[PDB]
Specification:
It is classed as cytosolic protein. The structure is cut from a larger assembly and holds chains A (102 residues), B (49 residues), C (48 residues), D (70 residues), E (404 residues) and F (26 residues). Chain B is mainly beta. Chain B has strands spanning 9-16, 19-24, 29-32. Chain B is built from no helices and 3 strands. In chain E, the strands form 2 sheets. A 5-stranded antiparallel β-sheet of chain E has the order 3-2-1-4-5, with no helix packed on it. Chain E is extended, with a radius of gyration of 29 Å. Classes of the chains: A alpha+beta (102), B mainly beta (49), C mainly alpha (48), D mainly beta (70), E alpha/beta (404), F little secondary structure (26). The interface between C and E is medium-sized, with 30 and 39 residues. The structure holds adenosine-5'-triphosphate (ATP) and magnesium ion.
Chain lengths: 102, 49, 48, 70, 404, 26
């Protein structure tokens, strides 16, 4: 019982948190600086945190920026447009292969 | 002198007995409730609010 | 196979350098950095 | 104490919140959603919503202040 | 000095000249591998045994903190007074900001991007370069694999294009003595499936200048002002670099007759075409840039793109004759194991209408049909089946010999 | 002359918002 309530309390604690922006990288820079392009508008030069190495960073990727002070947060799945839903059939409850006949 | 001004928008569909989806003129849309004594029968989709 | 793999590795181990901020020689900075540049952010305003 | 904690967690979405639209899911309890005001965001998700309803796109609810997905 | 050669070539070493399972190749690639491992080891020791570091001069951190941590990028537009320039942000909001020291007040010029602070919004630096990731991506850096050895015999065309794009670089003594400007524009036209892109690949494989490659229906954006600006930046980045060359493929998507009609999007297409047309040969200068432009139908082009002065040489690729078919067959089946029975004479002479890609497909189909019955060596009947059973869609004409 | 035509698009300019000034003048 104690473990269960502790877990729930911690989750509630975490939900009280601020969001973050997502940004496109155009190129890295020297001495821990990146050049990013925030979605609404802007062209910023931002700093990385301690848990990410620059060599992970390459042009045209998605990074998360802390909204409080514009720092690199992490690197996340690369871009795609909205039209991928109709593409890549995900389940195939389809016909078999032997009912063709001829 | 103490009035406030208010946003004008339109009711989209009704969602549940107390929840409505509404949209501003040029802002985003929102999910909202409806006030005390407000005769909800009038709240047809498309009405001005 | 391992040729191309080590190619990938050797190219990643290389990135770039910039030195493109336009900073002047330190003599031009003078001690003006503290004296008036520090005393220039707060006194003025943007004035659109 | 457990009862009281559930009581607090219940009143986290009974708020006049905003509609976004789902964009992508990265891993468990985390996603990327673009709000109707532009400004594409990246936020946790609540621990009680069913997962298999949000693959390609959807009308999702976003907390007014924290942008937490509900 | 401009950005210089900026060469684009991996091209490690091709010598696999044995082209079989011989020892020479094994020892040679052994040498290649051990040199590459040696260089990797050197760079590891270079990065591992660095003992010296202070790198702050007790003031670099001072300048770093004086400027804000999340610096933003803006566009200078005027400089009315010293220490009081005027800049603007993205949204077009100007601000009468100040100019601080520690910024070389030499290289700033109206229209150049600058680095600005947040809280006070003054100018704190200059951004050296700004190229969007739609033009740097067009560039090539790993050369494609082919070379002149694979071409099936086009001596006239090869010699022509070599005098066009390659010769003025290596041996530029003659042209000055004669007093001529070498040609700058080339069109490659003809039926489909003949080799127009092979010469592009082969030229890009062996060169010394920068190579830029663009496909036709890509110079188009929807915001009414991006097309022509992107074209202008393309030519700017080409010219600031080395003696580069640009390859525009499948043009007819861009240039077609410039007529007058109703819709605004088509007006945008025409506007972009016309901007490129100016860029290539307009007012004062052109620079040291060559342009190759490839298409499979030519009559539907605007007469203003083709006139000499803008495009100086036109090169037609015709269907192969019986001399060339033997060369093509000899090339595409070189690395094939093959039986003593077959004679390519019958295949080349029986038909009189086919092209390079067609020959390649015949080769692969025949080899696969030989595999079908659990064999490796190829025989004559396999080639017969390959030619006749598929690889032929048909057409009709001149019925029943009205002429005799 | 029937129509199957198309067109381009201009952007939406309205994007700016005010922000709290943080001048430090004594
Ligand atoms: N003379 C030749 N020697 C060797 N290979 C050839 C020759 N002519 C054609 N080929 C073959 O043709 C193909 C090259 O494509 P090609 O350059 O003909 O296309 P294209 O003319 O650009 O066609 P499209 O109109 O489809 O774009 C390769 O498979 C190449 O092997
Ligand atoms: Mg082609």
């Amino acid at each position: 019982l104690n473990a269960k309530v502790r877990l729930l309390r911690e989750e509630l604690q975490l939900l009280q948190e601020q969001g973050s922006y997502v940004g496109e990288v155009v190129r890295a820079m020297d001495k821990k600086k990146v050049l990013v392009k925030v979605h609404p508008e802007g062209k910023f030069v931002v700093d990385v945190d301690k848990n990410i190495d620059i060599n992970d960073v390459t042009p045209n990727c998605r990074v998360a920026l802390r909204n409080d002070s514009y720092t690199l947060h992490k690197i996340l799945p690369n871009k795609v447009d909205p039209l991928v839903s109709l593409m890549m059939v995900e389940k195939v409850p389809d016909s078999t292969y032997e009912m063709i006949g001829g | 002198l103490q009035s406030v001004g208010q946003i004008v928008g339109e009711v989209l569909k009704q969602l549940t007995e107390e929840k409505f989806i509404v949209k501003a003129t040029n802002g985003p849309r929102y999910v909202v409730g409806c006030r005390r004594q407000l005769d909800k029968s009038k709240l047809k989709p498309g009405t001005r609010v | 196979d391992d040729i191309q793999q080590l190619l990938k590795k050797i190219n990643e181990l290389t990135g770039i350098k910039e030195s493109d901020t336009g900073l002047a020689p330190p003599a031009l900075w003078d001690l003006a950095a503290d004296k008036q540049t520090l005393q220039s952010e707060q006194p003025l305003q943007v004035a659109r | 104490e457990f009862l009281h904690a559930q009581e607090e967690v219940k009143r986290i979405q009974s708020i006049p919140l905003v509609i976004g639209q789902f964009l992508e899911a990265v891993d468990q309890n985390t996603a990327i959603v673009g709000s109707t005001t532009g400004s594409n965001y990246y936020v946790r998700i609540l621990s009680t919503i069913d997962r298999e309803l949000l693959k390609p796109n959807a009308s999702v609810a976003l907390h007014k202040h924290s942008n937490a997905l509900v | 000095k401009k950005k210089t050669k900026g060469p684009d070539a991996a091209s490690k070493l091709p010598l696999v000249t044995p082209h079989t399972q011989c020892r020479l190749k094994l020892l040679k690639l052994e040498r290649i591998k051990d040199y590459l491992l040696m260089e990797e080891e050197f760079i590891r020791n270079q990065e591992q045994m660095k003992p010296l570091e202070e790198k702050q001069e007790e003031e670099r951190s001072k300048v770093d903190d004086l400027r804000g941590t999340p610096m933003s990028v803006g566009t200078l537009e005027e400089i009315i007074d010293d220490n009081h320039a005027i800049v603007s942000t993205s949204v077009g909001s100007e601000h009468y900001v100040s100019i601080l020291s520690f910024v070389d007040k030499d290289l700033l010029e109206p229209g150049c991007s600058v680095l600005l602070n947040h809280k006070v919004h003054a100018v704190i630096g200059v951004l050296m370069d700004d190229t969007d990731p739609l033009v740097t991506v067009m560039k090539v850096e790993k050369a494609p694999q082919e070379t002149y050895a694979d071409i099936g015999g086009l001596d006239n065309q090869i010699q022509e294009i070599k005098e066009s794009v390659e010769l003025p670089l290596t041996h530029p003594e003659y042209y000055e003595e004669m007093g001529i400007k070498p040609p700058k524009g080339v069109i490659l036209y003809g039926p489909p499936g003949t080799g127009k892109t092979l010469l592009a690949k082969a030229v890009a494989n062996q060169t010394s200048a920068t190579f830029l490659r663009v496909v036709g229906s890509e110079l188009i954006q929807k915001y009414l002002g991006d097309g022509p600006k992107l074209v202008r930046e393309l030519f700017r980045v080409a010219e600031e670099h080395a003696p580069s060359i640009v390859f525009i493929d499948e043009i007819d998507a861009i240039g077609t007759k410039r007529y007058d009609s109703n819709s605004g999007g088509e007006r945008e297409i025409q506007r972009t075409m016309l901007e490129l047309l100016n860029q290539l040969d307009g007012f004062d200068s052109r620079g040291d840039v060559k342009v190759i432009m490839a298409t499979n139908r030519i009559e539907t082009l605007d007469p203003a793109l083709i006139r000499p002065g803008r495009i100086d040489r036109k090169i037609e690729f015709p269907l192969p004759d019986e001399k060339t078919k033997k060369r093509i067959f000899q090339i595409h089946t070189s690395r094939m194991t093959l039986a003593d029975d077959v004679t390519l004479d019958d295949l080349i002479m029986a038909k009189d209408d086919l092209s390079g890609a067609d020959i390649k497909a015949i080769c692969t189909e025949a080899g696969l049909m030989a595999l079908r019955e659990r064999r490796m060596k190829v025989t004559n009947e396999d080639f017969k089946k390959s030619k006749e059973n598929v690889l032929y869609k048909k057409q009709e004409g001149t019925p029943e010999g009205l002429y005799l | 002359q029937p129509s199957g035509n198309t067109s381009s698009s201009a952007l939406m300019q309205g994007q700016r918002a005010p922000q709290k000034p943080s001048q430090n003048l004594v």
